[PDB]
C-alpha cells in the first residue's frame, strides 16, 4: 500500500522540470520538488525506494543540451540529489533495473546514435560500461523480465526499427529476439506477468495506438487491445497488475490522458489526466512522500 506513480520531466514547448505523483487509490495528484535541470526524453526508475531520473535533454529557447545526468529523488525528504554522471549524454534513453543496478541503454548525443550500454551501482555511486547492443537505438524501449534486459525498437539514425534484443548479464552478451510486428520508435515498453509489452510509438508515418506483447517462453509477439489514443513518447509503468500510459504526442496535441490496461479483460480505460499535456516523461512507482 501507499505507492504512487511518479512522472518526472517531459516536454511541452520546452523541456520541463515537473515532478508530479498520481495516487491510483484516490485519484489525486501531488506537485513535488522540481528537477534541478529541466529534461525531456529521460527515463525514470526506482531502486531501494529512491526515484532516479536518467539522461534526457534540456531543450530550451536558448539551447539543446543532452544529459549525462543521474539524479536521485528521496520521497522521505522531497529533495533531489545529484549522483554520478554517465559516461556519455543520452537523450531519448531507455533504462531497466536488474538486481539493484540501473542499466542505461542507447540514446542520442547530437547526431550520434548510441549502441553503448552502462550499468550503475548505487552502493558505490559508480557507472561502468557493459557490452553494447547489436544495434544503435534511440527512442528505445527497455524493460526487465526474469533478470534479463530487453531493448525494443527505436531509431538507428536511418530507419525506425521493429527489431529487439536481449542482454544476458552473466555472459555480458546481447542477442536478437523475434522482431515486433510493428515498427516502433518512442514507444512505451514495460513488463507485465511473463510478457514484454510495447505500446504506441511512431512507425515512420504515424503515431500508434496499437499494443503488442512478447511472451518470453513462446518467443512470439501478439497484439492486444489498442489504446484509446495514438501516442509517441509516452510514459509507462505497471502498478498492481495493470499498465498505465501517461501523456505523449498524438500528432496534434501533447496529451494529458492517462490510460490503464487491464490484462484480464483486455481493455483500456481512461483513469485520470495529468495536470498539463506533455510528452517524453520518465515514470516510476515508489512510496508516497
Ligand atoms: C513534436 O514534438 C515532440 C513530439 C514528440 C515527442 C517530443 S519530446 O520532446 O518528448 N522528444 C523529442 C526529441 O528528443 O527529439 C522525444 C522524447 C523521447 C523519444 C523521442 N523519439 N526518439 C525517436 C523518435 C522517432 O521519431 O523515431 C522519437 C519521437 C517520440 C517519437 C522523442 C516532442
From Swiss-Prot:
It is found in: Cytoplasm; Nucleus. Keywords: Cytoplasm, Kelch repeat, Nucleus, Repeat, S-nitrosylation, Thioether bond, Ubl conjugation, Ubl conjugation pathway. The keyword Nucleus applies. GO terms for molecular function: disordered domain specific binding; identical protein binding; RNA polymerase II-specific DNA-binding transcription factor binding; transcription regulator inhibitor activity; ubiquitin-like ligase-substrate adaptor activity. Changing residue 57 to A: Impaired interaction with SQSTM1/p62. Abolished interaction with SQSTM1/p62. GO terms for cellular component: actin filament; centriolar satellite; Cul3-RING ubiquitin ligase complex; cytoplasm; cytosol; endoplasmic reticulum; inclusion body; midbody. Component of the BCR(KEAP1) E3 ubiquitin ligase complex, at least composed of 2 molecules of CUL3, 2 molecules of KEAP1, and RBX1. Interacts with NFE2L2/NRF2; the interaction is direct. Forms a ternary complex with NFE2L2/NRF2 and PGAM5. Interacts with (phosphorylated) SQSTM1/p62; the interaction is direct and inactivates the BCR(KEAP1) complex by sequestering it in inclusion bodies, promoting its degradation. Interacts with NFE2L1. Interacts with BPTF and PTMA. Interacts with MAP1LC3B. Interacts indirectly with ENC1. Interacts with SESN1 and SESN2. Interacts with HSP90AA1 and HSP90AB1. This is Kelch-like ECH-associated protein 1. It comes from Mus musculus.
Amino acid at each position: 500500500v501507499g505507492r504512487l506513480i511518479y512522472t518526472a520531466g517531459g516536454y511541452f514547448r520546452q523541456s520541463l522540470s515537473y515532478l508530479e505523483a498520481y495516487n491510483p487509490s484516490n485519484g489525486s495528484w501531488l506537485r513535488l520538488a522540481d528537477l534541478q535541470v529541466p529534461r525531456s526524453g529521460l527515463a525514470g526508475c526506482v531502486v531501494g525506494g529512491l526515484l532516479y531520473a536518467v539522461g534526457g535533454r534540456n531543450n530550451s529557447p536558448d539551447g539543446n543540451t543532452d544529459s549525462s545526468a543521474l539524479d536521485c529523488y528521496n520521497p522521505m525528504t522531497n529533495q533531489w540529489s545529484p549522483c554520478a554522471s554517465m559516461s556519455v549524454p543520452r537523450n531519448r534513453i531507455g533504462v531497466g533495473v536488474i538486481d539493484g543496478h540501473i542499466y542505461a541503454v542507447g540514446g542520442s548525443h547530437g547526431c550520434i546514435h548510441h549502441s553503448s550500454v552502462e550499468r550503475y551501482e548505487p552502493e558505490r555511486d559508480e557507472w561502468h560500461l557493459v557490452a553494447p547492443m547489436l544495434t544503435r537505438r534511440i527512442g528505445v524501449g527497455v524493460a526487465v523480465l526474469n533478470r534479463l534486459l530487453y531493448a525494443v525498437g527505436g531509431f538507428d539514425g536511418t530507419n525506425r526499427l521493429n527489431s529487439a534484443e536481449c542482454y544476458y548479464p552473466e555472459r555480458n552478451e546481447w542477442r536478437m529476439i523475434t522482431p515486433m510486428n510493428t515498427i516502433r520508435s518512442g514507444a512505451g515498453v514495460c513488463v507485465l506477468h511473463n510478457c514484454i509489452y510495447a505500446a504506441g510509438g511512431y512507425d515512420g508515418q504515424d503515431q500508434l495506438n496499437s499494443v503488442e506483447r512478447y511472451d518470453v517462453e513462446t518467443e512470439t509477439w501478439t497484439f492486444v487491445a489498442p489504446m484509446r489514443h495514438h501516442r509517441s513518447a509516452l510514459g509507462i509503468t505497471v502498478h498492481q497488475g495493470k499498465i498505465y500510459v501517461l501523456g505523449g504526442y498524438d500528432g496534434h496535441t501533447f496529451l494529458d490522458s492517462v490510460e490503464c490496461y487491464d490484462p484480464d479483460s483486455d481493455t483500456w480505460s481512461e483513469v485520470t489526466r495529468m495536470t498539463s499535456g506533455r510528452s517524453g516523461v520518465g515514470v516510476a512507482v515508489t512510496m508516497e512522500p
